[PDB]
RNA sequence: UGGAGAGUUUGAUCCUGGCUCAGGGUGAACGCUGGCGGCGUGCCUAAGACAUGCAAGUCGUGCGGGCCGCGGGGUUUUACUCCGUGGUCAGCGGCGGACGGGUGAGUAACGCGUGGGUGACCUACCCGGAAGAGGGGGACAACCCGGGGAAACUCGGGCUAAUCCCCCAUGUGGACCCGCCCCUUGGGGUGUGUCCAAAGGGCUUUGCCCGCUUCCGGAUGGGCCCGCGUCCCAUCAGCUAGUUGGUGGGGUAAUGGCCCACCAAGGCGACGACGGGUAGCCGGUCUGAGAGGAUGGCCGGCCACAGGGGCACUGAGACACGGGCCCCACUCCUACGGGAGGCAGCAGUUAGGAAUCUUCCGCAAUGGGCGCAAGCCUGACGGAGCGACGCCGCUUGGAGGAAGAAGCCCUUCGGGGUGUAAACUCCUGAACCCGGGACGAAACCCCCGACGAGGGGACUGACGGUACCGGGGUAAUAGCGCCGGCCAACUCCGUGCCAGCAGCCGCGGUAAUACGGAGGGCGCGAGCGUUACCCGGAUUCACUGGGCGUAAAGGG
């Protein structure tokens, strides 16, 4: 019994926790953005979306989402937001949208 | 392992002289001449008509005995011959001859095939520089055998040389009788060897 | 010998233990104790260099005891005698001594060849004295047991979850090292 | 990563090495990409070691990071030498 | 470049036709016998249980810390301290532990083989190039104290670094939505908008090295999907309900019923689905004239599982053999509350079983990993040990030598056989002893050259004092099967349908070429035979190449 690979496990635990923090928060932010989009608040909503995007990017940069997954997520969010905005709003801050 | 044991008995069994001692197997003493029949009790009995298989088997045995080899080795040689293209019998014979011991015997280095083999084993026989001690050594054409450096001054070898002094060698062979040397030139064809064996029968036996 | 606890009245046990003295080490035999006469006579192996004889204060000397004594004699040992349970009120060592004398063995207090040390097997009594006596006997009799051709003896052979085929060996002669070919009977390795 | 390395074949006491291109995480006998050369330690043949040079160079260029022994062999052959 | 048959239903024949046999082979095994040497190779059974030792770590050139050691002090001493250090010890941090090594239970499936596809994708390390690397903050181990708990271990408070984490700045770039253009499924280019970088140590330090961050290009490694090929059973005939398609979303590196919501009612099937059994698959191997047939040991790839099952986490990559969590099963301790385990890694233990090796030495070679490096690690591997388990190589002498010893055996009593075999003469000289003695190992390392090419230096051997050479030097293990026909090779005694043999016909009930023995022979030979399976013969499942009036067979 007993090997110095418990260290790795410990490391992973910490990393897992950090990952969870990154990811859950991101998810929450996304949800909030979606909610904002729902009625047509636009500017604040846009800001929130931007923040979420930033968070996602940060996660990608670190050892969380990584790669193109983050990008995909962003696309999903942004497109959804745009769709929601079609029900009243139009880009008020400029923000995440390409206008 | 060798056959080992009683030799001219085998000759008797076949009914044709097999020259398995050299001398005595040349004189009135090979038992071919004094008595010509098979060994043991029913040798002098009425000889029954042998089956088709049997004759072939006998021939094969004769051949093997003549070349003095283990059966497995013989089989392997045959297989090799079959694999190679040409005349599966003549080629096979040639291959067998190419066995170092046989070559030595031919070159008159030793008066008997077993004797030759023994000589080869006991480091008395050199193939182009190195003393070679295994009679299963196959010689490819245009290659030099010699009585070894430290075996040139032994009595038996001298005697052998004397015996072969005067009497000529096979067309595939050349020997330097002065310096106990012997080049294996051509690969020996069937026509060169007036052996009593019929290779065809052997081949047939092998087939199945 | 070490002070730990009691194992119980079980009729098995692992093998020989090593009791420690100021002069040396003394090997004590802890196989199945009673034998129930495993072998009547081996061939003449000399398992133990010496053999002590335990005599109860309640039972006295038994046919079993006699047999043990005989075995010891056969082996080649100057017999030490021990009167067990002397703290309890039914103890009579004098009787035991008399019996021994009758048998043939004369203690040193009367003038003879036998060694008699009574022991208490409950409180902690005379053990050290006994050990000392044994040591003295060893130096007197010259019972000493390596550069010679190695020799041992099989005490017991068994099987384990945390090993395999295990054989409890006692060394007579030589130096035994891990990683060497040995034979014992017809079984080798 | 991709390595130029030596693959043991042959017999006991008669070793033979294939100067070969393969992935790092492989059997030292395993599925290699390409046989670029061969090497006999025992120096038994006249043409005892031989490697095709151009292929090796190409591999290097791509990024085949050789083993030390392999590198040495290559140098001996005349791959790393430039003019 | 390749193909042998025979014995047997009968009084005899001809066929039809089964059975049996020679041939070769096995991861074999058993019996008897047994010299070596080379090489290959050795739980095909219970994927049963498993001890012990080891099998995967390493970097102080990432960083703090304790234990010690020194060189020197500040220090009277003792501290404490400071560095250079030398090692350790554990921690953080990184990289590797997904490679290597094993087993073949499951899985008959895109699992594999194969040929493609990926405009539907990833790829740490490696290389190619581009661009960077500006500032500020923080926690957390270790450590110290404080508990809880039998132990396993563990919770609480505080401290502290760092390539740990965070945040701001820059933007070569890229990421995304939207638009436009060219493509053609999500490929490439561009515009507006939003978002995203990082980190340092080392010295011969004003100079380079290792690392770094983003990107594209490659490289290999894969993920996923499809075309075709993939066992038997039809006495398995209907199967299906996330099942078949859609829309939307989730999840993924990525597509997809992968998953979910909702709509639709399909989808597959006798060109064999579903069900049962069976089985890893192949490159191959064995056989065979070939077509085929069987098998998948070792070696190479791929898959799958690491007591059984389930599931995530971390990362370039696992659903993770020597990581994790959980339930069950089992073994192991318990102060009964709880933990510890996993050999299908090497060796070994047992148990099953006909049967299968050494608890070996080594990092020397190759390869792996980490590392600037030395170097550390390595049951990968290199070798050694055991086993005639295969295959091959050699020895058990050779040359003489009776019109024929003895011994034994038959005889028709003359004789014949063993048999030139022996004895005996001559010669050689495995073993054996001495003397030497390797190839495998030239590099990484240092110095000169710029740390490049190139030049020189040096070390480094488990095997192994082995192989092998040089000298000497003994005549120095023969066994097993069979002997009626197949089928090679025959007589006598003993036995009397008994004892026995047998693979098949069948031999044996008083002269047995078939039984026991003896001689003699024949086959092989350090082996030979028996058993088991597989192929062959068997054109007995016939594609090449069997047929069907009466043989088995035409359905009414
Ligand atoms: Zn003759």
Curated annotation (Swiss-Prot), chain A:
Region (Disordered): 1-25
GO CC terms: small ribosomal subunit
Domain of life: Bacteria
Keyword Iron-sulfur listed: no
GO molecular function, one term: small ribosomal subunit rRNA binding
Any single biological process term in GO: translation
Record Pfam families: Ribosomal_S20p (PF01649)
UniProt entry keywords in alphabetical sequence: Ribonucleoprotein, Ribosomal protein, RNA-binding, rRNA-binding
HAMAP family: Ribosomal_bS20
Subunit structure: Part of the 30S ribosomal subunit.
Family: Belongs to the bacterial ribosomal protein bS20 family.
Entry protein name: Small ribosomal subunit protein bS20
Native source organism of the sequence: Thermus thermophilus (strain ATCC 27634 / DSM 579 / HB8)
Curated annotation (Swiss-Prot), chain B:
PROSITE patterns documented for this protein: RIBOSOMAL_S4, S4
Domain of life: Bacteria
GO cellular-component term (any): small ribosomal subunit
Record's cofactor remark: Binds 1 zinc ion per subunit. In a number of structures (e.g. 4Y4O, 5FDV) a 4Fe-4S cluster is seen in place of the zinc cofactor.
Keyword flag GTP-binding: no
Cofactor: Zn(2+); [4Fe-4S] cluster
Keywords: Metal-binding, Ribonucleoprotein, Ribosomal protein, RNA-binding, rRNA-binding, Zinc
CDD domains reported in the protein's UniProt record: S4
Subunit details: Part of the 30S ribosomal subunit. Contacts protein S5. The interaction surface between S4 and S5 is involved in control of translational fidelity.
Protein family membership: Belongs to the universal ribosomal protein uS4 family.
Entry-linked NCBIfam families: PRK05327.1 (NF003717), rpsD_bact (TIGR01017)
Name of the protein this chain belongs to: Small ribosomal subunit protein uS4
Organism: Thermus thermophilus (strain ATCC 27634 / DSM 579 / HB8)
Protein encoded by which gene: rpsD
From Swiss-Prot, chain C:
Domain of life: Bacteria
Segments of this protein annotated with the region G2: 9-13
Region of interest (G5), ranges: 120-122
Binding site for GTP: 30-34, 84-87
G3: annotated span: 30-33
Localization, UniProt: Cytoplasm
Domain tr-type G: start-end pairs: 1-143
G4, as annotated region: 84-87
Described purpose of this protein according to its UniProt entry: One of the essential components for the initiation of protein synthesis. Protects formylmethionyl-tRNA from spontaneous hydrolysis and promotes its binding to the 30S ribosomal subunits. Also involved in the hydrolysis of GTP during the formation of the 70S ribosomal complex.
Similarity section: Belongs to the TRAFAC class translation factor GTPase superfamily. Classic translation factor GTPase family. IF-2 subfamily.
UniProt-recorded name of the protein: Translation initiation factor IF-2
Species name: Thermus thermophilus (strain ATCC 27634 / DSM 579 / HB8)
Shown part of the complete sequence: 97 to 286 of 571
Curated annotation (Swiss-Prot), chain D:
Keywords: Ribonucleoprotein, Ribosomal protein
Assembly behavior: Part of the 30S ribosomal subunit.
GO cellular component, one term: small ribosomal subunit
Biological-process GO terms, alphabetical: translation
Pfam families attached to this UniProt entry: Ribosomal_S16
Keyword Protein transport assigned: no
Gene3D superfamilies in the record: 3.30.1320.10
Superkingdom of this protein's organism: Bacteria
Protein name: Small ribosomal subunit protein bS16
Family: Belongs to the bacterial ribosomal protein bS16 family.
Function: Binds to the lower part of the body of the 30S subunit, where it stabilizes two of its domains.
Source organism of this protein record: Thermus thermophilus (strain ATCC 27634 / DSM 579 / HB8)
GO molecular function terms attached to this record: structural constituent of ribosome
Lineage of source species: Bacteria, Thermotogati, Deinococcota, Deinococci, Thermales
Keyword set includes Isomerase: no
């Amino acid at each position: 019994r007993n090997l110095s690979a418990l260290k790795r496990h410990r490391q992973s635990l910490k990393r897992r926790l950090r990952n969870k923090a990154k990811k859950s928060a991101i998810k929450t932010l996304s949800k909030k953005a979606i909610q904002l989009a729902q009625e047509g608040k636009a500017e604040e909503a846009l800001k929130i979306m931007r923040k979420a995007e930033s968070l996602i990017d940060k996660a990608a940069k670190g050892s969380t989402l990584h790669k193109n997954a983050a990008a995909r997520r962003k696309s999903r969010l942004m497109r959804k937001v745009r769709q929601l905005l079609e029900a009243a709003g139009a880009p008020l801050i400029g923000g995440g949208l390409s206008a | 392992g060798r056959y080992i044991g009683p030799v001219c008995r085998l000759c008797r069994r076949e009914g044709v002289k097999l020259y398995l001692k050299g001398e005595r197997c040349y004189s009135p003493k090979c038992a071919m001449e004094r008595r010509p029949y098979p060994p043991g009790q029913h040798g002098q009995k009425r000889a029954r008509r042998p089956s088709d298989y049997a004759v072939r088997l006998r021939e094969k045995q004769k051949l093997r005995r003549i070349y003095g080899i283990s059966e497995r080795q013989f089989r392997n040689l045959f297989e090799e011959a079959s694999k190679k293209k040409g005349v599966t019998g003549s080629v096979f014979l040639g291959l067998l001859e190419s066995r170092l011991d046989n070559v030595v015997y031919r070159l008159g280095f030793a008066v008997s095939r077993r004797q030759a083999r023994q000589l080869v084993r006991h480091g008395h026989i050199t193939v182009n520089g190195r003393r070679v001690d295994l009679p299963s050594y196959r010689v490819r054409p245009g290659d030099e055998i010699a009585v070894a450096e430290k075996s040139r001054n032994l009595e038996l070898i001298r005697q052998n040389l004397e015996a072969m002094k005067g009497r000529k060698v096979g067309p595939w062979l050349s020997l330097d009788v002065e310096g106990m040397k012997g080049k294996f030139l051509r690969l020996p064809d069937r026509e060169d060897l007036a052996l009593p064996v019929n290779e065809q029968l052997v081949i047939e036996f092998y087939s199945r | 010998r070490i002070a730990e606890k009691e194992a119980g009245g079980i009729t098995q046990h692992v093998g020989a233990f090593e009791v420690k003295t100021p002069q040396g080490t003394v090997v004590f035999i802890d196989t199945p104790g009673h034998e129930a006469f495993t072998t009547i006579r081996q061939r003449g192996a000399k398992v133990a260099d010496i053999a002590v004889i335990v005599i109860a204060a309640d039972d006295g000397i038994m046919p079993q005891t006699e047999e043990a004594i005989a075995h010891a004699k056969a082996a080649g040992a100057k017999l030490i005698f021990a009167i067990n349970k002397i703290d309890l009120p039914q103890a009579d060592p004098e009787k035991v001594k008399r019996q021994l004398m009758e048998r043939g063995f004369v203690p040193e207090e009367y003038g003879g060849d036998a060694i008699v040390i009574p022991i208490s097997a409950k409180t902690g009594q005379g053990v050290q004295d006994l050990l000392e006596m044994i040591l003295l006997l060893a130096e007197l009799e010259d019972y000493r047991a390596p550069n010679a051709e190695p020799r041992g003896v099989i005490l017991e052979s068994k099987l384990d979850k945390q090993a395999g085929i295990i054989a409890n060996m006692l060394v007579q002669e030589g130096t035994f090292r891990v990683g060497d070919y040995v034979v014992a009977g017809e079984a080798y390795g | 990563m991709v390595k130029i390395r030596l693959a043991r074949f042959g017999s006991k006491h008669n070793p033979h090495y294939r100067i070969v291109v393969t992935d790092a995480r492989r059997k030292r006998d395993g599925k290699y990409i390409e046989k670029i050369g061969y090497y006999d330690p025992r120096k038994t043949t006249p043409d005892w070691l031989k490697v095709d040079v151009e292929r090796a160079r190409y591999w290097l260029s791509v990024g085949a990071q050789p083993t030390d022994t392999a590198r040495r062999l290559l140098r001996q052959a005349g791959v790393f030498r430039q003019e």
